[PDB]
């Protein structure tokens, strides 16, 4: 099973063929770190970690599974809130902050007991957004509910129809108003393949 | 920019072929059975600092 964080924290803090062979898989650990960066509406994220006995390499070992209409609704709420923020309020952050001579910051002394700031969350009016209010900004929403998610591996989902109405209403900014495929006429993949095979250019199409 | 992004999409649609059948692939399951690796639960920022200092 798992292990407390203080041990691996001491591992990384106090610090060769067993040390040499584990260093081969470094960009794989970089990929597993980069594919699980937390969302703007999350404050903290707790993930599992595989690590070597001497702290040679540290892995993430988690696939970022999300439910698709919930994910689109959450990013549409982000879009609305950031439009709201630029029409209301800009100072860009100064890039690379940590200078070339100082080491990276220690987590046990500076970030560990400091409470983070307020994240990006919409108001979520309790009259209309009532079926979505208790789970909209969770890490993995509705995970421990047997009605909606099949289990802990978080693979299959089924929802109710007012919930789908609410998630379609909140995601209205990211979705087009199309109703049929009488749109995309001579602007679809088969016409693009025909223009590829005949070496011509559709007006607005690619070359 | 629209026309070039649509060019990349048409190229990815045309060059698509079905993937070849193979055995299911699990790197971390073979890493877990090794006694040289341990599992824990950490914050994202702490492991993000650990990965970059190990790379340094």
């Amino acid at each position: 099973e798992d292990m407390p964080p203080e041990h691996v924290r001491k591992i990384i803090r106090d610090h060769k063929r067993v040390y040499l062979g584990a260093l081969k898989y470094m960009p794989h650990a970089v990929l597993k770190l980069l594919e699980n960066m937390p969302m703007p509406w999350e404050q903290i994220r707790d993930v599992p970690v595989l690590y070597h006995i001497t702290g040679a390499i540290s892995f993430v070992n988690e696939i970022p599974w999300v439910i698709e209409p919930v994910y689109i609704s959450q990013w549409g709420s982000m879009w609305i809130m950031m439009r709201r923020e630029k029409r209301d309020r800009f100072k860009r952050m100064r890039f690379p902050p940590f200078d070339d001579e100082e080491p990276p910051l220690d987590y046990a002394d500076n970030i560990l007991d400091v409470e983070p700031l307020e994240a990006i969350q919409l108001e979520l009016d309790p009259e209309e957004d009532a079926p979505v209010l208790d789970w909209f900004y969770d890490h993995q929403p509705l995970r421990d509910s047997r009605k909606y998610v099949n289990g802990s591996t978080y693979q299959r989902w089924q929802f109710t129809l007012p919930m789908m109405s609410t998630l379609y209403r909140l995601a209205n900014q990211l979705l087009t108003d199309l109703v049929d495929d009488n749109y995309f006429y001579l602007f679809d993949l088969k016409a693009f393949f025909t223009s590829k095979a005949l070496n011509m250019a559709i007006p607005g199409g690619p070359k | 920019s629209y026309q070039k992004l649509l060019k990349y999409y048409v190229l990815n649609a045309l060059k698509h072929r079905p993937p070849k059948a193979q055995k299911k692939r699990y790197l971390f399951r073979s890493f877990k059975a090794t006694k040289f690796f341990q599992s824990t639960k950490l914050d994202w920022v702490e492991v993000g600092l650990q990965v970059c200092r190990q790379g340094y």
Partner: peptide
């Protein structure tokens, strides 16, 4: 000697996914 044998066994196990088709 043991650690290199363990990582070589894991390399052979990662090579097992395509072993009978590639060689």
């Amino acid at each position: 000697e043991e650690a290199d044998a363990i990582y070589a066994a894991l390399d052979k196990r990662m090579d097992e996914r395509r072993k009978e088709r590639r060689e």
